[PDB]
Design a binder for this molecule. Structure first.
Ligand code: MG
Ligand code: MG
Ligand code: MG
Ligand code: MG
Ligand code: MG
Ligand code: MG
Ligand code: MG
Ligand code: MG
Ligand code: MG
Ligand code: MG
Ligand code: MG
Ligand code: MG
Ligand code: MG
Ligand code: MG
Ligand code: MG
Ligand code: MG
Ligand code: MG
Ligand code: MG
Ligand code: MG
Ligand code: MG
Ligand code: MG
Ligand code: MG
Ligand code: MG
Ligand code: MG
Ligand code: MG
Ligand code: MG
Ligand code: MG
Ligand code: MG
Ligand code: MG
Lengths: 137, 116, 208, 23, 96, 86, 66
RNA sequence: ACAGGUUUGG
RNA sequence: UAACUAAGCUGUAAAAAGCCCUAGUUAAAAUAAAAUAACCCACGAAAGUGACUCUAAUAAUCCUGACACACGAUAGCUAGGACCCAAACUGGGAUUAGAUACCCCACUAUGCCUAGCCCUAAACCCAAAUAGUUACAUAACAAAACUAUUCGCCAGAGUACUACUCGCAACUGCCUAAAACUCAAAGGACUUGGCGGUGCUUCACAUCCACCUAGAGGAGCCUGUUCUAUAAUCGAUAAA
RNA sequence: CUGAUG
């Protein structure tokens, strides 16, 4: 049982299949987890969006969509709208450190989606644009 | 390893600018800080999952599947016994970790000597 | 509080002493229990060495008793057992020879089986985390489960009956329903199990 | 401590600046 | 300790070595001063706080007829003696 | 952006285990220092505070390392006292 | 009543642990430790000579001795 | 200057 | 800036305001800045400097030494250019009795480059430079106590980083810098209480929760209070 | 979350 946590780079001759497809054909699920909202959007391998569901579109409100239950419901709805189009496996791309980070991830499994690759793509500026000032002066 | 300390503080013999600005004098105290309510994790989660699987599959009845009901109780009893026996075994022994109540008495036997 | 720390619990079982030679491991502790000059508390007025009484029946009568009127709860339990026995005898005499080999008539057995059927498995504990209370599913002890199973039945027979229906008459039907697992106590137990299964995702919040 | 005299000089300089702005 | 440089002979790879010549000279002087006190009926108290030979020191003091002290040394023992020991006591004439 | 996709900060699950893979990915970022870096870059800090934070962290690390070293050096003397009652 | 005379007319204390604060308690501790060392050496000699003629007198359950 | 009084809970 | 998807996005402890030419993904110049390495301590006289490469280059066969000469962070000024992002000011939305503040949104000067000024900092390592010592020696704390040659300062505190002068591309400025008057104090460290709307730990066997029993808040009555009403008691009137 | 004075 030789299992490597490294992703199956297309440059190699590895044979890893999910539902008959290769790792390059598996759809993507972008989960932008901000500090006040968690958006989930499902796109195909050709960068074509399939399903879109956010904590705001789930019927929540200002402080209600910041909790983890809102991200879990958003993930359930996204998984439902994705399975409505016939998808099996997905690659989760997490963006931003928010409270609904793991909730939106487990929401897809609770709504019926198989998570195979969790990629953390968080924007880390190499001292680029100057961010806002500090609070509690 | 331990980071270097030469040429860090502000002294008369140091010709460069001091690098480290200590809030308090870097003297090793004779008593460690008390651990902020060392906690533990739950138990028998995997045994409860396979137990509730019977309820979700057979429509919430215990007469259908039984071993998933007995192993759960066995895990609960073993956890209840380990919560009471280890709470004394680990406080009597010192193989692994130890509370600060003993670290303080261990350090006071061989304290630091700031003077002389 | 009048019993100091040196007072231990009594031992009412006569058979525990009627065979002291048949074993050595039990003799080893019984030969020192008195040689240590250990003081023993007084035998309770509700518990005796009678072979027809049961600690489960005693606990249920104590939980049913309101205030301090003990004879009222005793008579209620007697009437309940009598009604159960007579209804089972009626069902036995109104059945055929095939159902006679399956229908039981033991009131103690029916009561204990009903309690075992109504005994829950896992409960819910409110844990405060992040300023909110979450109902974490937690395994309960045997005494906790039995106490909940008895209290649910007692509360249902107290509040969910009619003024014309008596407590023994209502409990005689509740026990027969709990024996066949078709009663509101089993319904409440299944509701508890469903609410625990719906919250099992919060099991990582428990610390014991 | 020394913040007494520091704040004293601060208040004096602030009053001087306000006087300059007024006149 | 800084006051051991004149009483040390050298250092063999970190471990210091004591000069046994001066050791024996000081030991001769110490034993002479100890014998004279015991001859002149002097109270000799072996004070030594070390939990390895506390039994040996007490046995030596018992066999010598002199007094020993290897337990927790109290604060006002020798100073506040008229309150710790008794009304009027006789302090040890020699401490070892 | 210009680098290849699904290579940097990627963890492959095994047998559909999601929680363990997420904990592994999180430990990766904590050991690499990205979690604290993002939590610090959320709001801009001035160099007057940056130097102070660096000095504080250096002193804290030095003190913790010295305490751990002395604890590991004195752990031998934790055994039962063989000279009790002397 | 109070404590008896500790030192004679010459001033020399009678007991050998008078300068310890508890000339009775510390003497008892010393005698107990001496008997313990003697018993330890006796048991070691017995183990070396392959002789086990003693028993464990610690279980005082039927006696009730505290 | 052979000095003393005077700040402060001290 | 273009293409697909959705009616929502940002926003706080909670909201509102703002934007719905909005939001996510795929691509995308110009400008600003330069993650980890850094637990490193080097360079430079100091301020200062750590995204990469190239050219030039970092004085004194080496004492101290100005009011002379030359530099001198951010902030400010002038002219030209740039403007992603942050933001003085300003306009709104919260909270407060009030908030022209801390909280949220938009936006400007400004932060960015060249040329020319202004020459200020807790410019603090509050410890001057040059060659050394561990001798005597703890006011307190702090970075232990000191030698020989020097440079520049120090005469109670407030008045006072003030006015009057001189000089300065500076003109609400900078350097130098008093006096009248008021008081017998003004100051640094320390010891102990008190306090803290800054912290950490501890347990309560009717106690906080996990939990058990019986009660008040629903009806009437009694009784005691706070109120209206009279010429018509009073005290108590948070745990207590 | 906020709460002024003696
Ligand atoms: Mg400090
Ligand atoms: Mg401290
Ligand atoms: Mg003034
Ligand atoms: Mg004073
Ligand atoms: Mg609005
Ligand atoms: Mg542009
Ligand atoms: Mg950079
Ligand atoms: Mg230098
Ligand atoms: Mg040079
Ligand atoms: Mg020169
Ligand atoms: Mg602009
Ligand atoms: Mg902006
Ligand atoms: Mg405004
Ligand atoms: Mg500028
Ligand atoms: Mg400048
Ligand atoms: Mg500076
Ligand atoms: Mg200065
Ligand atoms: Mg002192
Ligand atoms: Mg000079
Ligand atoms: Mg003056
Ligand atoms: Mg100035
Ligand atoms: Mg001026
Ligand atoms: Mg209570
Ligand atoms: Mg009543
Ligand atoms: Mg009422
Ligand atoms: Mg009333
Ligand atoms: Mg009254
Ligand atoms: Mg009154
Ligand atoms: Mg009064």
């Amino acid at each position: 049982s030789s299992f490597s946590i490294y992703p199956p780079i297309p440059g190699q001759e590895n044979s890893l299949r999910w539902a008959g497809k290769k790792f390059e054909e598996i759809p993507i699920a972008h989960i932008k987890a901000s500090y006040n909202n968690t958006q989930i959007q499902v796109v195909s391998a050709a960068h074509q969006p399939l399903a879109h569901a956010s904590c705001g579109t789930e019927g929540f409100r200002n402080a209600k969509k910041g909790t983890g239950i809102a991200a879990q419901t958003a993930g359930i709805a996204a998984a439902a709208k994705a399975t409505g189009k016939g998808v099996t496996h997905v690659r989760v791309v997490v963006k931003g450190l928010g409270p609904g980070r793991l909730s939106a991830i487990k929401g897809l499994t609770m709504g019926g989606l198989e998570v195979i690759s969790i990629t953390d793509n968080t924007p880390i500026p190499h001292n680029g644009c100057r961010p806002r000032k500090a609070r509690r002066l | 390893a331990t980071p270097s300390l030469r040429g860090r503080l502000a002294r008369l013999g140091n010709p460069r600018r001091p690098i480290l600005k200590p809030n308090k004098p870097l003297i090793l105290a004779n008593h460690v800080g008390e651990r902020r309510r060392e906690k533990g994790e739950a138990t028998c989660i995997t045994e409860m999952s396979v137990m509730m699987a019977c309820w979700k599959q057979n429509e919430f009845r215990d007469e259908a599947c039984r071993k998933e009901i007995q192993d759960f109780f066995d895990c609960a009893s073993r956890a209840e016994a380990a919560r009471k026996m280890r709470s004394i075994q680990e406080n009597l022994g010192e193989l692994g970790s130890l509370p600060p109540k003993k670290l303080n008495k261990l350090l006071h036997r061989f304290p630091n000597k700031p003077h002389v | 509080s009048r019993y100091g720390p040196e007072y231990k619990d009594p031992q009412i079982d006569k058979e525990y002493y009627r065979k002291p030679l048949a074993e050595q491991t039990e003799e080893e502790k019984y030969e020192r229990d008195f040689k240590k000059t250990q003081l023993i508390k007084a035998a309770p007025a509700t518990k005796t060495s009678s072979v027809f009484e049961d600690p489960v029946i005693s606990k249920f009568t104590n939980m049913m008793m309101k205030g301090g009127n003990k004879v009222l709860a005793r008579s209620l339990m007697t009437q309940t057992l009598e009604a159960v026995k007579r209804k089972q005898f009626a069902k036995y005499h109104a059945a055929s020879a095939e159902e006679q080999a399956t229908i039981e008539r033991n009131p103690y057995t029916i009561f204990h089986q009903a309690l075992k059927n109504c005994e829950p498995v896992i409960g819910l504990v409110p844990i405060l985390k992040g300023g909110h209370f979450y109902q974490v599913p937690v395994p309960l002890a045997d005494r906790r489960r039995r106490f909940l199973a008895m209290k649910w039945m007692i509360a249902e027979c107290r509040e969910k009956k009619h003024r014309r229906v008596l407590m023994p008459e209502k409990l005689s039907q509740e026990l027969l329903e709990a024996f066949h697992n078709q009663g509101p106590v089993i319904k409440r137990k299944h509701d508890m199990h469903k609410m625990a299964e719906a919250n099992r995702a919060l099991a990582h919040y428990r610390w014991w | 401590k020394n913040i007494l005299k520091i704040r004293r000089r601060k208040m004096n300089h602030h009053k001087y600046r306000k006087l300059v702005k007024r006149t | 300790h800084r006051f051991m440089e004149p009483y040390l002979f050298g250092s063999r790879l970190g471990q210091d070595i004591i000069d046994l010549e001066q050791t024996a000279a000081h030991l001769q002087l110490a034993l002479n001063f100890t014998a004279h006190v015991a001859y002149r009926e002097g109270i000799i108290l072996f004070v030594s706080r070390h939990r390895q030979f506390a039994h040996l020191i007490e046995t030596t003091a018992r066999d010598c007829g002199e007094y020993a002290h290897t337990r927790y040394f109290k604060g006002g023992l020798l100073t506040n003696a008229p309150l710790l020991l008794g009304p009027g006591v006789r302090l040890p004439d020699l401490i070892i | 952006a210009n680098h290849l996709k699904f290579i940097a900060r990627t963890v492959m699950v095994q047998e559909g285990n999601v929680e363990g893979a997420y904990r592994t990915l999180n430990r990766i970022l904590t050991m690499d220092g990205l979690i604290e870096d993002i939590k610090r870059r959320r709001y801009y800090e001035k160099p007057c505070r940056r130097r102070q934070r660096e000095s504080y962290e250096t002193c804290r690390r030095i003190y913790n390392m010295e305490m751990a070293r002395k604890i590991n050096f004195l752990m031998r003397k934790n055994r039962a006292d063989p000279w009790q009652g002397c | 009543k109070q404590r008896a005379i500790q030192w004679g007319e010459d001033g020399r204390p009678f007991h050998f642990l008078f300068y310890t604060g508890k000339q009775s308690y510390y003497s008892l501790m010393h005698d107990t430790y001496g008997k313990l060392l003697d018993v330890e050496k006796h048991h070691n000699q017995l183990r070396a000579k392959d002789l086990l003629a003693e028993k464990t007198k610690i279980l005082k359950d039927p006696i009730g001795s505290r």
